[PDB]
Amino acid sequence: MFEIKKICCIGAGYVGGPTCSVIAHMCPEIRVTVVDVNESRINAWNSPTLPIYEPGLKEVVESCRGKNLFFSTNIDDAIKEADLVFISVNTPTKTYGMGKGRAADLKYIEACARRIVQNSNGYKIVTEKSTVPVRAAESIRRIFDANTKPNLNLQVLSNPEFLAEGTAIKDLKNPDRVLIGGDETPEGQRAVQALCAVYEHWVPREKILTTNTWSSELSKLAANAFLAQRISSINSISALCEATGADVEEVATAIGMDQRIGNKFLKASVGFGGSCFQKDVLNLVYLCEALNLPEVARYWQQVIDMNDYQRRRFASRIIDSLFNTVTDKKIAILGFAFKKDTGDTRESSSIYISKYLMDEGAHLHIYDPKVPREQIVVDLSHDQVSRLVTISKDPYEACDGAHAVVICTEWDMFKELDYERIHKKMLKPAFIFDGRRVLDGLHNELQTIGFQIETIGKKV
Amino acid sequence: MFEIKKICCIGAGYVGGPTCSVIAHMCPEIRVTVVDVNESRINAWNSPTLPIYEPGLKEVVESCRGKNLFFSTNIDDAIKEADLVFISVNTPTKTYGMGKGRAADLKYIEACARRIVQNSNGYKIVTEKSTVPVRAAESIRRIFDANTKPNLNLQVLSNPEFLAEGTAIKDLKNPDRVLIGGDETPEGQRAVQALCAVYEHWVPREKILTTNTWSSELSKLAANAFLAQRISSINSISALCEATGADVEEVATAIGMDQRIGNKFLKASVGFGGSCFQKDVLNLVYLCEALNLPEVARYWQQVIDMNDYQRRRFASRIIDSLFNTVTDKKIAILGFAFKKDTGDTRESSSIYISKYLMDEGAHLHIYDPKVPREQIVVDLSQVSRLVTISKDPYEACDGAHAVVICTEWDMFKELDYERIHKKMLKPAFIFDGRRVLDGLHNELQTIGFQIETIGKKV
Amino acid sequence: VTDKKIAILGFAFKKDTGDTRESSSIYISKYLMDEGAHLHIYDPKVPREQIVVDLSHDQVSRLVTISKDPYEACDGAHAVVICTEWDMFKELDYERIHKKMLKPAFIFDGRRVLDGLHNELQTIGFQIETIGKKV
Ligand SMILES: O=c1ccn([C@@H]2O[C@H](COP(=O)(O)OP(=O)(O)O[C@H]3O[C@H](CO)[C@@H](O)[C@H](O)[C@H]3O)[C@@H](O)[C@H]2O)c(=O)[nH]1
């Protein structure tokens, strides 16, 4: 009855950090070491202020770091001394070659695999842990099969993480379900059981689903695409609301009361973001094209096309509402993160709205509570960032002297802003573009204040 | 407080009929009369055997027919007498004009509004209650605006119906929500409250949604589109599973367990049928095209296209497995209804699979416990040469090359497959389009069957 | 194939000549170059300078190397791509080539020259793929 005592995780990211921190917290007698090549990131995980923002993570991490949980960058000894090894690195979409701008680049998963083999002896369980697993588990096993040592016995499992950034701790503390994939051998089922026992410390038996490696990845690929589809479906409906004169918040409620559909993920928005959804759908389309399933690839493609359209339509409305020029006009961008309560910008619609407006000559003022200043400048370029982009220290700075305020991220605090103060210093007429619906019910207040408030899924 | 006391309902179909029979049942003190042009149909609504099969429906109707609920062809008098007039007539898709085979025809709706006006005096609330409402309430209000009598005071309302056929009685007795669309006038809100108060007899107040006319019709369209998309998405995954050795049922479980997705409506199938989904999606597309939203049109069009693909892929697998020749080969089709526990065959998947096989010259033998023989011969119209309606499943499999399962009748598991296989031609194939035979796989294989099912391949 | 060493054995359009004009080796090389591979080309007769010319419009500087013998082209390589039927390629020491390759070690026989060598190469440990025949 193999029991896991030492866990090494390769990847100190939004997935790896939080996951292992909870595993450490819930399991005191099992030592968990998180390793990364990025010294900066590891130093931060060891300091008072962490490298990522996640509600509740500070308490989790500080309650068992140095008792039971470690951060090292010494990848070699952690691997050597471990029973289970997570691979939680990133898989960027390729920038050249076939599958450019679509297919996932497995160059880090492979390099990891290769290093494990170099530093491993005896038995070890290697589990692939990611948001979007694209032929991950197979790649690893392919490396291990071909690079065997004497008395080395490596098992490959799949274990896709379902956490959502912003609510990671809650999700990791109480997940809808846990998904472990491993070979339908007896070698095999034993490694699955041994990981199953890890989770059985805080997740009950019948919430842990055990299937085969591939099924597990296909399950994650599909699940991510279904959720992405809901957001796009309601976003499509939001477009229809605007041309006909209904409310998408109202239409969404009517929909959501059907228990077969359910009421979650029906908030219309400027466009879904994050390192998952788009990457997931593009890789699902690519997979399908490779298996000669054009019809299926054509079907899921629409989830991307619709998201693009949502972003582009919202943008045109801004320029449209400002007499078809924003040249030399000051515009405030409130919220830069892809979603609330996180520092992460990857694939954020704020990045897209900002760029589209800069191309029309707007002087932007960006504010976000938790996105670092340096990140914003990177995202927004590839010098024009010098001329047009300023980074504000508070919302009211971004708004002073501004022709319009664009809300891109549903930060709670945005509802709580002093709007009498903001209107007073804006140039008139002052516009608010709510790309998140966060200012519903506030309509009347804001109009009477003198605003021309334009929001998605509702047209004047 | 305007109190409704007499209800008339033009259209006694799979919607008009049950809905009214339940309204009547829930409210003893209010008279419900259901009218229809079709004489044959109205006589069946009064007879021991109803014109539609729907579980629970018989005990419900025969608890208040001739007492609170009446069924009559005398339309002109039910209207004259009623405070509330439901419009539950079918809207076939236009066979000609701009938007042939896409848009819905509003000629029956328009001839109702004309009939209403003639036989109407005083205040009356007119309510459009259908499953795919397309600009419906706006066509009615428009006829009312044009033809104005002295002291006529008609109020138009939208009350779409969320019942699923085969579980209609449950869905009506205990709905998820009721949706009432009225004009944002005070005239208006008085009209909405009266109807709201009819439902308050059995429906809790926080399950009744009040909105304007259009916001109600758009929500219905969306609502049916969202469900159809669910089936098509899991169907697409089924194709991908067959190409890669996974199981769509196992995948649907893992997907379903996410509380933000929901576990309902993720059963992969030969494809969705019903008088709703296909009509509903195509209409949404047509609207979007009309409003200059080609982006939105193309998106929802993928729900229909995936469904066409799933059906066609299923048809090809059958043909393929029989060496690409099915001339004079007996095939059993089990299940002609679009779903289980109904006799409705509108847009049924079994129609399309059947016709594909028929194009290959196959001799078809069809069985359904509830679908009228005549309905099958109409739906497939060659008929004389290839199609036979079987009176029991075993006479459909006697000497057949393949058994094809299209409807999820509970009677289809539990068949004596020992007996079926003995009299079948080998190789004996079973094509399970509904996953009804799950679990039984090993039994069927040792019996000697080659069992093929959607979302899983050898 | 970013940063992956791959040996290109043969660059001539066919055996017993140094002519490279419209050789498949130029295309296979360019396709693998677009993947960011580090190519090490060997040919017994094709001049070194002619190769770099055929592989040009800087991408060459970063990605191409010309090998003086086959064994340096394969030393630490991920795959051996045979593109020209030089008789010498059948005669190579594939025991030696393997011990210094990165695994999985691949041989892509574009010319069918390693026929009848398949069992020796498999037991040695190569995953040998050829045209006109698949696993
Ligand atoms: O109703 C909604 C919900 C979300 N979004 C947007 O979509 C994006 C994604 O949000 P979310 O899904 O919560 O963040 P993720 O961290 O990407 O998490 C999702 O994707 C993860 C992998 O990234 C899965 O593991 C999780 O289960 C799933 O919740 C955000 O930009 C949101 O604004 C909407 O527009 N409307």
Ligand SMILES: O=c1ccn([C@@H]2O[C@H](COP(=O)(O)OP(=O)(O)O[C@H]3O[C@H](CO)[C@@H](O)[C@H](O)[C@H]3O)[C@@H](O)[C@H]2O)c(=O)[nH]1
């Ligand atoms: O997981 C599933 C569920 C259903 N179906 C099929 O989809 C079609 C339609 O199913 P169903 O929705 O149950 O029948 P409907 O009578 O069309 O009912 C739906 O459509 C109505 C409008 O027609 C709405 O009012 C209802 O709320 C909605 O449940 C049928 O052929 C089913 O077999 C599947 O293939 N897979």
